[PDB]
Amino acid sequence: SLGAKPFGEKKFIEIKGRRMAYIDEGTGDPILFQHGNPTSSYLWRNIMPHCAGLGRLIACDLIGMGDSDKLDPSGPERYAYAEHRDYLDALWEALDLGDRVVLVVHDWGSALGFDWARRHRERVQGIAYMEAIAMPIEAADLPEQDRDLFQAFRSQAGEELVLQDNVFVEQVLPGWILRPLSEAEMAAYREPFLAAGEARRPTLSWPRQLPIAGTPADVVAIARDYAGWLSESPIPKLFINAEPGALTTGRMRDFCRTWPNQTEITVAGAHFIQEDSPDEIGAAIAAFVRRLRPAHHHHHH
């Protein structure tokens, strides 16, 4: 359904001196849901219940986000992609996931999850993805109404816009959801970022990492690598396309449609499509997992 209550409860594991928070409900092989910017495990609260009984339902909060600890010191060099990957790789190792992981990814959750899959390909049973960073992009790949703002985040205006005014949480997030949010839903997204200053740094470092027009070169190389790998990978895929969409439209949507062994649905939504069409998304993920994990609870006629 479309509710404001979180799914499950937060567990915590010590990673590199910091506590990281995650949901881990049920038993079986993992179904691993990964949020991006400026969200948390809360993004998946109405999608995860559709997979009840199909596996261990896991949703991690990235470092500095959700209920995971902040890094200190923090500043313009903090919370880059490589640092997020170091913390997330460690958490995923600590979780003892095994070799039949279904990844469910969004946004920077897709850049992190796709790269992890490339590096652990025998351990990935299937990949469900939506509104993803599927390859290096140009400004033209962002919605026209958002291009100037993303260029502003990447400029020296970003500190005031984000650290002081919290614009990613307060403007970009509700602006990329079709329906109006309740106060409880906005409060759950605001909670990690209530405090001005470096507490909000992850939400500024993330747009500065987007691989746009060849910069930053290190993230561009990472996305080039996983794009080339995904386009030839036999791993089963579920593409949750969105209309109008935001990050995965036009030529990026066309590129994703070339990927092999892939099923597709289209749901209503812009970027944070989990807030507009959670039941359709969850039902498609559940059907995908049931196909990958045939349970044979009953005779087939």
Which helix (DSSP H) or strand (DSSP E) does residue 217 occupy?
Answer: helix 217-230
Q: Is the dihedral of CA 222, 229, 243, 51 positive or negative?
A: negative
**Was 108 annotated as part of a binding site?**
yes
201 dihedral zone (left: phi>0; alpha: psi -120 to 50; beta): alpha
Q: With beta carbons less than 8 A apart as the criterion, state whether 58 and 123 touch.
A: no
- Report which of 273, 222, 227, 212 is spatially closest to residue 246, judged by C-alpha positions: 273
Asked about 191 being catalytic, the answer comes back as: no
- Give me the count of residues in the chain: 301
**Was 46 annotated as part of a binding site?**
no
* 88 Cβ contact list (under 8 Å, min separation 6): 60, 62, 63, 112, 116
Q: Is the dihedral of CA 156, 223, 77, 204 positive or negative?
A: positive
Q: With beta carbons less than 8 A apart as the criterion, state whether 41 and 61 touch.
A: yes
Asked about 107 being catalytic, the answer comes back as: yes
Q: Which of 106, 271, 276, 280 is catalytic?
A: 271
Distance CA 248, CA 176 (A): 13
Q: Which residues is the chain interrupted after (C–N above 2.5 Å)?
A: none
* 99 Cβ contact list (under 8 Å, min separation 6): 122, 123
Asked about 131 being catalytic, the answer comes back as: yes
Q: Is the dihedral of CA 94, 67, 26, 127 positive or negative?
A: negative
The gap between the terminal CA atoms of the chain, to the nearest Å, is 32
Q: Which of 25, 61, 69, 107 is catalytic?
A: 107
Distance CA 248, CA 140 (A): 12
Q: Which of 115, 131, 275, 276 is catalytic?
A: 131
Distance CA 128, CA 295 (A): 20
> Which segments are annotated as binding site for chloride?
37, 108
Q: Which residues are catalytic?
A: 107, 131, 271
> Which segments are annotated as binding site?
37, 108
